[PDB]
Amino acid sequence: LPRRIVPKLATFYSANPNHEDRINRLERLLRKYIKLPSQNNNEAQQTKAPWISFDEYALIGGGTKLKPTQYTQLLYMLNKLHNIDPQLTNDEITSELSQYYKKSSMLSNNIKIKTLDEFGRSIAVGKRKSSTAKVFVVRGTGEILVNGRQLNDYFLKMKDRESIMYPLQVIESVGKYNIFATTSGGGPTGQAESIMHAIAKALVVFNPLLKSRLHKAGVLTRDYRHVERKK
């Protein structure tokens, strides 16, 4: 019947009572399920680890008192519980971990799978300096047209022609596609490399397994350099 006021948390007198209480809850789970084996897909480097940001954890983990090393300790225990084998996990672990998943469920993604159009053409846009290029890639025999003109007519420099061919040379498909490139703005170099960038982005639809090789060659990276007003 008699009532008294007491500290809410067992860690009240510690430096960060809120962080220590949360760590204790996770430590209890890691002790109760010490035996459960961990994922063997961890070697496969499963791409799932959506934990809340340091600032988001500071709302619940002591605010200003929260130290970076304390946040690092939270992630080492959240990941360890998360990496328990999915088949052998239980509700208790998942319930505790749910509160730490970055909230991104009410919203959706903005990416729709790219596909060939009604005529079998892959359309991509590329930009370099002030130049832009819109290319139409279709399966063919290596025919190229730049603004309706022959490649040797539009681009006089062989290095510009070699830049356009490089993405097709990476996937060894120089004679497997017809390119109808349209370019405007900047000069010959900007247009040739803008076409290069656009062909690389259009080739991924024909075989998405070659994106990694295209990225590694550097043709899918938009070149950011532009004329800078002297400051």
Partner 1 sequence: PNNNDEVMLLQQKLLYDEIRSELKSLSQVPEDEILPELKKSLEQDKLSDKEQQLEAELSDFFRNYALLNKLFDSTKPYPNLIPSANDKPYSSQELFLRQLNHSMRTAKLGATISKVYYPHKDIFYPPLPENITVESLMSAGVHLGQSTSLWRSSTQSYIYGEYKGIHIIDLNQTLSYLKRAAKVVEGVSESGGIILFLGTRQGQKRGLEEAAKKTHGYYVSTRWIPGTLTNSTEISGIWEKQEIDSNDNPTERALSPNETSKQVKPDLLVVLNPTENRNALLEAIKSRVPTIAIIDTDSEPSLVTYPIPGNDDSLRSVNFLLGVLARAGQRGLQNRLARNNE
Q: String of b and e for 184-222 (b: at least 16 CB within 10 Å)?
A: eebeebbbbbbbbbbbbbbbbbbeeebeeebeeeebbee
**What's 222's DSSP letter?**
P
Contact pick of 90, 99, 147, 212 for partner 1 (by CB under 8 A):
90
Interface mask (CB under 8 A) for partner 1, residues 54-73, using x and -?
Answer: --------------------
Q: Which is nearer to partner 1, 10 or 59 (CB)?
A: 10
Using CB under 8 A, which of the segments 79-87, 173-181, 185-193, 197-205 binds partner 1?
79-87
- Selected range binding partner 1 among 3-11, 47-55, 209-217, 220-228, rule: CB under 8 A: 3-11
DSSP string covering 158-220 = HHHHHHHHHHHHHTT-TTSEEEEEEEESS-HHHHHHHHHHHHHHHHTTT-GGGHHHHHHHTSS
* 6 contributes a contact to partner 1 by CB under 8 A: yes
Question: Residue 18 belongs to what H/E stretch?
Answer: helix 17-32
Report the alpha-carbon distance of residue 211 to residue 171 in Å, rounded: 10
Q: List the beta bridge partners of residue 122.
A: 137
Minimum distance from residue 198 beta carbon to partner 1 (Å): 30
Of 8-16, 71-79, 168-176, 207-215: span binding partner 1 (CB under 8 A)? 8-16
Residue of the chain from 71, 86, 138, 166 that contacts partner 1 (CB under 8 A):
86
Q: Is 57 left (phi over 0), alpha (psi -120 to 50) or beta?
A: alpha
Q: Which C-beta is closer to partner 1: that of 72 or that of 184?
A: 72
Asked if residue 132 binds partner 1 (CB under 8 A), the reply is: no
The yes or no reply on residue 96 touching partner 1 (CB under 8 A) is: no
Q: Interface with partner 1 includes 87 (CB under 8 A)? A: yes
C-beta closer to partner 1: residue 1 or 209? 1
Report CA-CA distances (Å) from 24 to 18, 19, 29.
10, 9, 9
Residue type, 185: G
Structure tokens at 151: 């490649």
Closest separation in Å from C-beta 78 to partner 1: 19
* CA–CA separation, 168 and 160 (whole Å): 14
Based on the shown chain and the rule CB under 8 A, indicate whether residue 89 belongs to the binding site for partner 1.
yes
Q: How many residues bind partner 1 (CB under 8 A)?
A: 28
Per CB under 8 A, does 173 bind partner 1?
Answer: no
Question: Does the footprint of partner 1 cover residue 33 (CB under 8 A)?
Answer: no
Least Å distance, CB 41 to partner 1, is 11
